[PDB]
Design a protein around this nucleic acid. Sequence first.
DNA 1: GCCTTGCCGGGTAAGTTCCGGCGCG
DNA 2: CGCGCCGGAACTTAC
DNA 3: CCGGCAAGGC
Length: 184
Amino acid sequence: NENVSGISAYLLGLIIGDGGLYKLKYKGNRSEYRVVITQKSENLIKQHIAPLMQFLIDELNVKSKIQIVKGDTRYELRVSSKKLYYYFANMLERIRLFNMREQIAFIKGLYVAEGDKTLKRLRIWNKNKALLEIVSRWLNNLGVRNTIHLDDHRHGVYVLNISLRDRIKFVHTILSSHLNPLPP
DNA sequence: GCCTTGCCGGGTAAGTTCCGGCGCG
DNA sequence: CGCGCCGGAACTTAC
DNA sequence: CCGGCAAGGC
Ligand SMILES: [Mn+2]
Ligand SMILES: [Mn+2]
Ligand SMILES: [Mn+2]
């Protein structure tokens, strides 16, 4: 299924960027498995992201709930689910095999999470150079030129800079792509 | 003249893991 | 008994 | 992430 594969890739962009995948161990041989996306904007969390996760949850027949925990500085969308955790973690492991549908959705998600949102410049930040290098190759194959270098010497954070020469192709083909959209 | 992009400090919007519960065969 | 979902938030830093 | 600064390219 390609609409599920794409929405997955997109969610996985948000997760890797602004959340995580947590395998927790508690006292008494108790455990927990968490798919997390955090975000400041209540409306983006509840009106765009959650309906997407909800759709994926239903289609996978995961029957965990979508928790939304309001925190200090940010909303946390959380799904407590061994099945969903491994679904994304295994999907992460085979990121290199992503097809063009998945690549674009992943880059879009990653950008919504980690990207320069003013679009004055086109920039993705991350400590994970290998992840950025994969994104770079995909972008090069989509005819979007880009460079990677160490932006934040204090915290070890790399930036992937998308060349403004390929501005239109990047925004039009990646950011504002109508592909795999909340069907309805 | 103009656009592009490496650089680098500010600080908030993220990320991570702990808690106490309850569920269920 | 042996794990897996809830609901929260303290805590730290990578964007 | 944001955003101002300055080096460099055409
Ligand atoms: Mn991140
Ligand atoms: Mn982030
Ligand atoms: Mn973000």
